[PDB]
Amino acid sequence: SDTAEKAQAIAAARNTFARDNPVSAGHHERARRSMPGGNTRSILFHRPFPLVIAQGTGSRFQDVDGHAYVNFLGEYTAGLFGHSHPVIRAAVERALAVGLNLSTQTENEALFAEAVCDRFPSIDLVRFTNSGTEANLMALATATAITGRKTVLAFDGGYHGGLLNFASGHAPTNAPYHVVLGVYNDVEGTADLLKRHGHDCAAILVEPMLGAGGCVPAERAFLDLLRAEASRCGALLIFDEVMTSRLSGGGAQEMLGISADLTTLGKYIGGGMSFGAFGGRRDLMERFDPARDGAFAHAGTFNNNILTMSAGHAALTQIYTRQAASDLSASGDRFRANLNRIAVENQAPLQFTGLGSLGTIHFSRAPIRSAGDVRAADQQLKELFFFHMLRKGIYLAPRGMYALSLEIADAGRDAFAEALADFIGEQRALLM
Amino acid sequence: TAEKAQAIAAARNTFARDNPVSAGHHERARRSMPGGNTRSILFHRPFPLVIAQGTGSRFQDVDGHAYVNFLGEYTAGLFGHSHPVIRAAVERALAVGLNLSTQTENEALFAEAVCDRFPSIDLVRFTNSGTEANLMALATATAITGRKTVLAFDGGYHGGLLNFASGHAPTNAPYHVVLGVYNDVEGTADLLKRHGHDCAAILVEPMLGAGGCVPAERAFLDLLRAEASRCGALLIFDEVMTSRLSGGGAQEMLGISADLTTLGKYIGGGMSFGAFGGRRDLMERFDPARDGAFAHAGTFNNNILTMSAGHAALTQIYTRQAASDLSASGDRFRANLNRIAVENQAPLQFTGLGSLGTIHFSRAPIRSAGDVRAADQQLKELFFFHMLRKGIYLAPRGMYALSLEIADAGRDAFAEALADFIGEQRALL
Ligand SMILES: Cc1ncc(COP(=O)(O)O)c(CN[C@@H](CC(=O)O)CC(C)C)c1O
Ligand SMILES: Cc1ncc(COP(=O)(O)O)c(CN[C@@H](CC(=O)O)CC(C)C)c1O
């Protein structure tokens, strides 16, 4: 729990950050005049104020006060390609040559859809959206319409987009689906909820690893329970792979040998352009065939926009192939293991959790299995870790998450590991 | 009618023989997407056209045929297919850097332009679509008021999770929505007496867009403004289409202020875009530094392509004066189309405002979803096919949305093809 001594250390770190970044401070005051709190994406705000970036290339960026950083945040997994990938750039140039806002289908949509279907083993048919939020809403829409049922089982700490935020329990802004929340990884508790609610369950919605909720892998016995009970009760199992799809050529489902009924996608698949998708079993997705009587409707001005169709096909087929996915996850597993070794050898009360190229620091010794474990870990030390990494020229999420891009190399990874050893040394007093 | 059914059979068959390369694309696209489709409004029988490329106001399909594009991406495509200023904005965004994972100055600059333009928007937040913008406005209203009921209108279209174009759709997000009749003062007053106490929001377009370019009458919008203030509901004007009609949208033209306003389409320069904005006191509930702040993340909300191209769109291309000029040009165009119908005693009209218009095969008043549905639907489909044969592309449902790239030759060609339709189909009219 919170102490005066940690608060004082945070106050000094905030004061140093403020004195070092006066141009960012002034941008925040101006931004407040047009956006609430100077903000249009809540996760970008942190106190005293966020850094404003001027420019970036490759894995690196520079803030408006002239400091340089390596970007380990990687746009919360969407920024797989760095800030200036030449193949992405060529795809943008091609989109512009085809033409913008053509108001009709192009072949580019079909080619992107075929790449997504080749790549993901339980997606027979796919439709594109403009966000992961839209992909998850459309999957819930599919489930409730098909089953005629209202109840949705999801999990505390689960994050499925702007209208489906359960990171801190029920949010008053959520779309008013009838959502029952379970505890992540809790076999017996979840089995009890499915016995009470199963018969009116339209859908079970779950990430195979909590992303925003702390990079907490799902355990097999938990995912097996969900898969078996969804089938038994006649609910659609929806795996939200908006973050986890990168973890192998075919995402977590290939790693697991477990198939969901629908799968949602987002982040890097559109080449860093706006993007989401929902897809799954043929018989479910065919309900969207507009030639069919009583077809479900799914419009959306930018669903098939040329920039996303072109960059996305390039991302999946020319850059982040299935082999590149295996190699990046192996690189990430080695990185994460090295960071935990540094913690263990120094007897530090911290660990990094995650899979492949995704991980999050948690200031705890306990196994990290559910949202409760994440919230019980020390939140002050997590904020102090954020400001420390900044001083060392390493940018990662305020909540302690990194997501390795393809542009991170040896020098970047070595600097992160060094910075961590330094944090442990310099903050030993607060780590008892 | 049997005679009209045969004319449609013949036109569908002729379209099919004209476009065998698009036919083969459709067979292949069915393999990976449901019905070969990722945006339902693009499908039409016997199959949709596939386009290969376009420049300015013109495109070419995969069979080689050229068209003037009068659809203009359902109002988003205001800049044509290759605007040099949009292109420069994309090049500047690439120079700044993609996926920078942080704020840049560009987002504040875009937001300043949006708040400057729209007279009831004190503060704004960006989304990735109009659908997201409307869902967040509903989230704001229900979360602030603590109430569940939303009044919307039959014919109304607010996005993929809020589609009332044919009444309640089974796929809509399960807000407790009550549907009135558009422009119906009596019936709508009644619904507000019954539901006012539990009403979080009144959600309404100042002109039905997808529902058929049907302008809202002043008495109807006055009713909604007065009742919303009386019962404590948030009035939400969905200006995703109508924002273009003046520099400050429909609200500037009307002198009526909604509590929240949703935006989309052309404002992000053609890039993915939506926004919700309004009264300062409502929007501050999203200040992330405030006590019990509402959360609104979204990976692409502040994306550099949208922020740069949208800033350019509002400040360099579609200025307040450009907006007045296009809407005037659009009013004169639509008047000419109606004069042609009138002079040829044709049983059709075009409804709309400024640069937006839709054909309806009826001479009755078009004031609600009922009136649009009652007009001849078979003649509407024949008209689409006929315009294609003349090298004019507009929506299957008979809507146009003039871009800045439409010029004298295109408008003249549209008008002559309308006159040709009336003469060639005289027997069915
Ligand atoms: C598992 C999962 N499922 C859905 C979403 C929503 O995707 P969009 O942000 O594209 O709407 C997300 C989005 N995650 C991030 C969105 C942002 O960076 O603004 C935010 C979270 C770290 C809270 C996700 O992680
Ligand atoms: C008044 C209004 N309000 C909200 C929306 C939703 O915008 P997004 O399609 O960008 O989500 C729309 C979008 N309508 C368009 C969607 C598309 O082109 O696929 C076209 C409609 C005729 C169905 C709108 O017209």
mmCIF file of N, CA and C in Angstrom, chain A residues 31-108:
data_model
loop_
_atom_site.group_PDB
_atom_site.id
_atom_site.type_symbol
_atom_site.label_atom_id
_atom_site.label_comp_id
_atom_site.label_asym_id
_atom_site.label_seq_id
_atom_site.Cartn_x
_atom_site.Cartn_y
_atom_site.Cartn_z
ATOM 1 N N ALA A 31 -3.524 22.981 -25.473
ATOM 2 C CA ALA A 31 -4.421 21.860 -25.854
ATOM 3 C C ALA A 31 -5.700 21.825 -25.048
ATOM 4 N N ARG A 32 -5.656 22.248 -23.769
ATOM 5 C CA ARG A 32 -6.841 22.216 -22.885
ATOM 6 C C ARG A 32 -7.950 23.093 -23.357
ATOM 7 N N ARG A 33 -7.604 24.101 -24.172
ATOM 8 C CA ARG A 33 -8.610 24.989 -24.720
ATOM 9 C C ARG A 33 -9.544 24.348 -25.762
ATOM 10 N N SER A 34 -9.117 23.257 -26.421
ATOM 11 C CA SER A 34 -9.937 22.642 -27.486
ATOM 12 C C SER A 34 -10.366 21.188 -27.270
ATOM 13 N N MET A 35 -9.628 20.469 -26.427
ATOM 14 C CA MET A 35 -9.967 19.078 -26.060
ATOM 15 C C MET A 35 -10.056 18.974 -24.534
ATOM 16 N N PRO A 36 -10.958 18.117 -23.993
ATOM 17 C CA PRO A 36 -11.125 18.017 -22.533
ATOM 18 C C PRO A 36 -9.826 17.548 -21.893
ATOM 19 N N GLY A 37 -9.285 18.335 -20.962
ATOM 20 C CA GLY A 37 -7.951 18.028 -20.435
ATOM 21 C C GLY A 37 -6.814 18.007 -21.451
ATOM 22 N N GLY A 38 -6.976 18.657 -22.609
ATOM 23 C CA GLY A 38 -5.940 18.595 -23.660
ATOM 24 C C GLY A 38 -5.739 17.213 -24.290
ATOM 25 N N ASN A 39 -6.792 16.395 -24.259
ATOM 26 C CA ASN A 39 -6.702 14.952 -24.505
ATOM 27 C C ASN A 39 -7.799 14.440 -25.476
ATOM 28 N N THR A 40 -7.450 13.505 -26.372
ATOM 29 C CA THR A 40 -8.462 12.833 -27.243
ATOM 30 C C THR A 40 -8.356 11.276 -27.220
ATOM 31 N N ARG A 41 -7.469 10.794 -26.363
ATOM 32 C CA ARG A 41 -7.201 9.373 -26.204
ATOM 33 C C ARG A 41 -6.702 9.204 -24.773
ATOM 34 N N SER A 42 -7.594 8.755 -23.865
ATOM 35 C CA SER A 42 -7.370 8.862 -22.420
ATOM 36 C C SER A 42 -6.025 8.281 -21.951
ATOM 37 N N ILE A 43 -5.596 7.188 -22.582
ATOM 38 C CA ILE A 43 -4.398 6.485 -22.132
ATOM 39 C C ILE A 43 -3.102 7.287 -22.351
ATOM 40 N N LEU A 44 -3.170 8.305 -23.189
ATOM 41 C CA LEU A 44 -2.021 9.182 -23.448
ATOM 42 C C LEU A 44 -1.770 10.216 -22.330
ATOM 43 N N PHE A 45 -2.797 10.520 -21.534
ATOM 44 C CA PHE A 45 -2.599 11.442 -20.406
ATOM 45 C C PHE A 45 -1.909 10.801 -19.180
ATOM 46 N N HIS A 46 -0.920 11.495 -18.643
ATOM 47 C CA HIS A 46 -0.401 11.177 -17.306
ATOM 48 C C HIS A 46 -0.023 12.503 -16.685
ATOM 49 N N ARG A 47 -0.019 12.537 -15.359
ATOM 50 C CA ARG A 47 0.385 13.736 -14.637
ATOM 51 C C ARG A 47 1.903 13.825 -14.677
ATOM 52 N N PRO A 48 2.484 15.038 -14.576
ATOM 53 C CA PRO A 48 1.887 16.384 -14.486
ATOM 54 C C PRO A 48 1.265 16.773 -15.827
ATOM 55 N N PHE A 49 1.871 16.299 -16.937
ATOM 56 C CA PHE A 49 1.350 16.458 -18.294
ATOM 57 C C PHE A 49 2.094 15.453 -19.198
ATOM 58 N N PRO A 50 1.507 15.075 -20.340
ATOM 59 C CA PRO A 50 2.172 14.133 -21.255
ATOM 60 C C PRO A 50 3.299 14.779 -22.064
ATOM 61 N N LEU A 51 4.271 13.975 -22.504
ATOM 62 C CA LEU A 51 5.245 14.477 -23.503
ATOM 63 C C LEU A 51 4.559 14.720 -24.826
ATOM 64 N N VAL A 52 4.906 15.829 -25.481
ATOM 65 C CA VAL A 52 4.537 16.062 -26.877
ATOM 66 C C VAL A 52 5.735 15.710 -27.764
ATOM 67 N N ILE A 53 5.507 14.836 -28.750
ATOM 68 C CA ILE A 53 6.593 14.443 -29.647
ATOM 69 C C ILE A 53 6.642 15.367 -30.894
ATOM 70 N N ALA A 54 7.843 15.664 -31.373
ATOM 71 C CA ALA A 54 8.051 16.479 -32.563
ATOM 72 C C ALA A 54 8.147 15.630 -33.819
ATOM 73 N N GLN A 55 8.880 14.523 -33.732
ATOM 74 C CA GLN A 55 9.246 13.801 -34.936
ATOM 75 C C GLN A 55 9.827 12.482 -34.533
ATOM 76 N N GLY A 56 9.730 11.478 -35.395
ATOM 77 C CA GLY A 56 10.428 10.232 -35.179
ATOM 78 C C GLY A 56 10.714 9.450 -36.458
ATOM 79 N N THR A 57 11.736 8.600 -36.368
ATOM 80 C CA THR A 57 12.114 7.693 -37.448
ATOM 81 C C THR A 57 12.539 6.363 -36.844
ATOM 82 N N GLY A 58 12.298 5.265 -37.564
ATOM 83 C CA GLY A 58 12.678 3.942 -37.082
ATOM 84 C C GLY A 58 12.081 3.661 -35.705
ATOM 85 N N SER A 59 12.949 3.269 -34.763
ATOM 86 C CA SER A 59 12.532 2.964 -33.408
ATOM 87 C C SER A 59 12.615 4.173 -32.459
ATOM 88 N N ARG A 60 13.018 5.326 -32.977
ATOM 89 C CA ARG A 60 13.367 6.454 -32.099
ATOM 90 C C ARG A 60 12.466 7.673 -32.300
ATOM 91 N N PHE A 61 12.269 8.488 -31.258
ATOM 92 C CA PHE A 61 11.568 9.758 -31.447
ATOM 93 C C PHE A 61 12.158 10.865 -30.611
ATOM 94 N N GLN A 62 11.752 12.104 -30.909
ATOM 95 C CA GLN A 62 12.244 13.266 -30.188
ATOM 96 C C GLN A 62 11.097 14.144 -29.732
ATOM 97 N N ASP A 63 11.167 14.604 -28.485
ATOM 98 C CA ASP A 63 10.092 15.403 -27.917
ATOM 99 C C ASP A 63 10.343 16.868 -28.241
ATOM 100 N N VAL A 64 9.352 17.717 -27.977
ATOM 101 C CA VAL A 64 9.429 19.130 -28.341
ATOM 102 C C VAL A 64 10.452 19.905 -27.507
ATOM 103 N N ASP A 65 10.975 19.287 -26.449
ATOM 104 C CA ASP A 65 12.071 19.905 -25.664
ATOM 105 C C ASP A 65 13.462 19.390 -26.071
ATOM 106 N N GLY A 66 13.491 18.556 -27.108
ATOM 107 C CA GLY A 66 14.753 18.088 -27.685
ATOM 108 C C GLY A 66 15.337 16.799 -27.156
ATOM 109 N N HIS A 67 14.617 16.076 -26.296
ATOM 110 C CA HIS A 67 15.146 14.805 -25.781
ATOM 111 C C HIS A 67 14.801 13.676 -26.743
ATOM 112 N N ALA A 68 15.704 12.696 -26.839
ATOM 113 C CA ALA A 68 15.508 11.512 -27.696
ATOM 114 C C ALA A 68 15.250 10.266 -26.868
ATOM 115 N N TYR A 69 14.420 9.361 -27.411
ATOM 116 C CA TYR A 69 14.047 8.127 -26.738
ATOM 117 C C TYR A 69 13.958 6.981 -27.749
ATOM 118 N N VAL A 70 14.176 5.762 -27.273
ATOM 119 C CA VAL A 70 13.788 4.570 -28.023
ATOM 120 C C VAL A 70 12.340 4.213 -27.600
ATOM 121 N N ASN A 71 11.507 3.907 -28.596
ATOM 122 C CA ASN A 71 10.077 3.714 -28.353
ATOM 123 C C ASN A 71 9.795 2.232 -28.146
ATOM 124 N N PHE A 72 9.738 1.823 -26.878
ATOM 125 C CA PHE A 72 9.403 0.448 -26.481
ATOM 126 C C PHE A 72 7.902 0.255 -26.331
ATOM 127 N N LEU A 73 7.147 1.345 -26.392
ATOM 128 C CA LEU A 73 5.667 1.300 -26.259
ATOM 129 C C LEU A 73 5.059 0.751 -27.560
ATOM 130 N N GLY A 74 5.533 1.235 -28.697
ATOM 131 C CA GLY A 74 5.115 0.611 -29.985
ATOM 132 C C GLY A 74 3.613 0.741 -30.250
ATOM 133 N N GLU A 75 3.053 1.918 -29.926
ATOM 134 C CA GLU A 75 1.616 2.225 -30.091
ATOM 135 C C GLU A 75 0.699 1.148 -29.512
ATOM 136 N N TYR A 76 1.007 0.681 -28.296
ATOM 137 C CA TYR A 76 0.186 -0.339 -27.625
ATOM 138 C C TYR A 76 -0.059 -1.526 -28.549
ATOM 139 N N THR A 77 1.016 -1.948 -29.234
ATOM 140 C CA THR A 77 1.123 -3.148 -30.116
ATOM 141 C C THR A 77 0.777 -2.878 -31.556
ATOM 142 N N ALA A 78 0.227 -1.698 -31.837
ATOM 143 C CA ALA A 78 -0.100 -1.364 -33.228
ATOM 144 C C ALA A 78 1.119 -0.922 -34.056
ATOM 145 N N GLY A 79 2.132 -0.394 -33.369
ATOM 146 C CA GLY A 79 3.303 0.257 -34.014
ATOM 147 C C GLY A 79 4.397 -0.763 -34.268
ATOM 148 N N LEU A 80 4.053 -1.876 -34.902
ATOM 149 C CA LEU A 80 4.976 -2.968 -35.138
ATOM 150 C C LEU A 80 6.140 -2.618 -36.090
ATOM 151 N N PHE A 81 5.979 -1.546 -36.849
ATOM 152 C CA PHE A 81 6.849 -1.268 -38.014
ATOM 153 C C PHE A 81 7.787 -0.091 -37.804
ATOM 154 N N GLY A 82 7.736 0.473 -36.590
ATOM 155 C CA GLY A 82 8.430 1.737 -36.283
ATOM 156 C C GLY A 82 7.731 2.939 -36.904
ATOM 157 N N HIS A 83 8.412 4.081 -36.891
ATOM 158 C CA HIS A 83 7.803 5.340 -37.289
ATOM 159 C C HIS A 83 7.950 5.662 -38.777
ATOM 160 N N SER A 84 8.728 4.865 -39.505
ATOM 161 C CA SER A 84 9.011 5.196 -40.924
ATOM 162 C C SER A 84 9.427 3.989 -41.787
ATOM 163 N N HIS A 85 8.622 2.919 -41.776
ATOM 164 C CA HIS A 85 9.006 1.669 -42.447
ATOM 165 C C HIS A 85 8.899 1.855 -43.964
ATOM 166 N N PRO A 86 9.951 1.459 -44.718
ATOM 167 C CA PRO A 86 9.909 1.827 -46.147
ATOM 168 C C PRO A 86 8.853 1.052 -46.949
ATOM 169 N N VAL A 87 8.515 -0.146 -46.479
ATOM 170 C CA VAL A 87 7.509 -0.961 -47.147
ATOM 171 C C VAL A 87 6.127 -0.390 -46.847
ATOM 172 N N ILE A 88 5.899 0.071 -45.611
ATOM 173 C CA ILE A 88 4.625 0.773 -45.313
ATOM 174 C C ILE A 88 4.487 2.010 -46.187
ATOM 175 N N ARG A 89 5.546 2.811 -46.227
ATOM 176 C CA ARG A 89 5.590 4.013 -47.053
ATOM 177 C C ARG A 89 5.263 3.743 -48.546
ATOM 178 N N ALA A 90 5.838 2.677 -49.094
ATOM 179 C CA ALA A 90 5.558 2.306 -50.468
ATOM 180 C C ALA A 90 4.096 1.906 -50.650
ATOM 181 N N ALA A 91 3.533 1.231 -49.652
ATOM 182 C CA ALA A 91 2.118 0.883 -49.697
ATOM 183 C C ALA A 91 1.217 2.131 -49.696
ATOM 184 N N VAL A 92 1.593 3.159 -48.908
ATOM 185 C CA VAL A 92 0.857 4.442 -48.904
ATOM 186 C C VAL A 92 0.910 5.143 -50.283
ATOM 187 N N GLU A 93 2.107 5.168 -50.870
ATOM 188 C CA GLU A 93 2.315 5.732 -52.207
ATOM 189 C C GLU A 93 1.449 5.016 -53.259
ATOM 190 N N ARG A 94 1.361 3.684 -53.179
ATOM 191 C CA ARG A 94 0.476 2.905 -54.068
ATOM 192 C C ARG A 94 -1.024 3.208 -53.872
ATOM 193 N N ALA A 95 -1.453 3.357 -52.611
ATOM 194 C CA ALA A 95 -2.850 3.708 -52.297
ATOM 195 C C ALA A 95 -3.219 5.035 -52.935
ATOM 196 N N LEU A 96 -2.320 6.001 -52.811
ATOM 197 C CA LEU A 96 -2.556 7.335 -53.336
ATOM 198 C C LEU A 96 -2.658 7.282 -54.865
ATOM 199 N N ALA A 97 -1.851 6.422 -55.502
ATOM 200 C CA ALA A 97 -1.907 6.198 -56.980
ATOM 201 C C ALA A 97 -3.198 5.535 -57.442
ATOM 202 N N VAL A 98 -3.692 4.573 -56.684
ATOM 203 C CA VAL A 98 -4.994 3.986 -56.976
ATOM 204 C C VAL A 98 -6.100 5.091 -56.875
ATOM 205 N N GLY A 99 -6.084 5.864 -55.793
ATOM 206 C CA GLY A 99 -7.070 6.945 -55.613
ATOM 207 C C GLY A 99 -7.750 6.848 -54.252
ATOM 208 N N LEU A 100 -8.075 8.006 -53.674
ATOM 209 C CA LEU A 100 -8.711 8.057 -52.340
ATOM 210 C C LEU A 100 -10.226 8.151 -52.469
ATOM 211 N N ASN A 101 -10.946 7.635 -51.485
ATOM 212 C CA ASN A 101 -12.403 7.847 -51.413
ATOM 213 C C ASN A 101 -13.161 7.432 -52.696
ATOM 214 N N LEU A 102 -12.773 6.298 -53.277
ATOM 215 C CA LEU A 102 -13.361 5.858 -54.548
ATOM 216 C C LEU A 102 -14.825 5.402 -54.481
ATOM 217 N N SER A 103 -15.404 5.273 -53.273
ATOM 218 C CA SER A 103 -16.868 5.165 -53.113
ATOM 219 C C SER A 103 -17.431 3.830 -53.609
ATOM 220 N N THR A 104 -16.522 2.864 -53.800
ATOM 221 C CA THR A 104 -16.808 1.582 -54.425
ATOM 222 C C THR A 104 -15.796 0.551 -53.923
ATOM 223 N N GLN A 105 -16.069 -0.722 -54.181
ATOM 224 C CA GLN A 105 -15.069 -1.783 -53.970
ATOM 225 C C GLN A 105 -13.902 -1.693 -54.903
ATOM 226 N N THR A 106 -12.725 -2.032 -54.368
ATOM 227 C CA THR A 106 -11.532 -2.282 -55.173
ATOM 228 C C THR A 106 -11.061 -3.723 -54.903
ATOM 229 N N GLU A 107 -10.137 -4.199 -55.723
ATOM 230 C CA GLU A 107 -9.630 -5.551 -55.550
ATOM 231 C C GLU A 107 -8.795 -5.640 -54.267
ATOM 232 N N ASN A 108 -8.249 -4.502 -53.834
ATOM 233 C CA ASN A 108 -7.350 -4.456 -52.670
ATOM 234 C C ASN A 108 -8.000 -5.044 -51.394
#
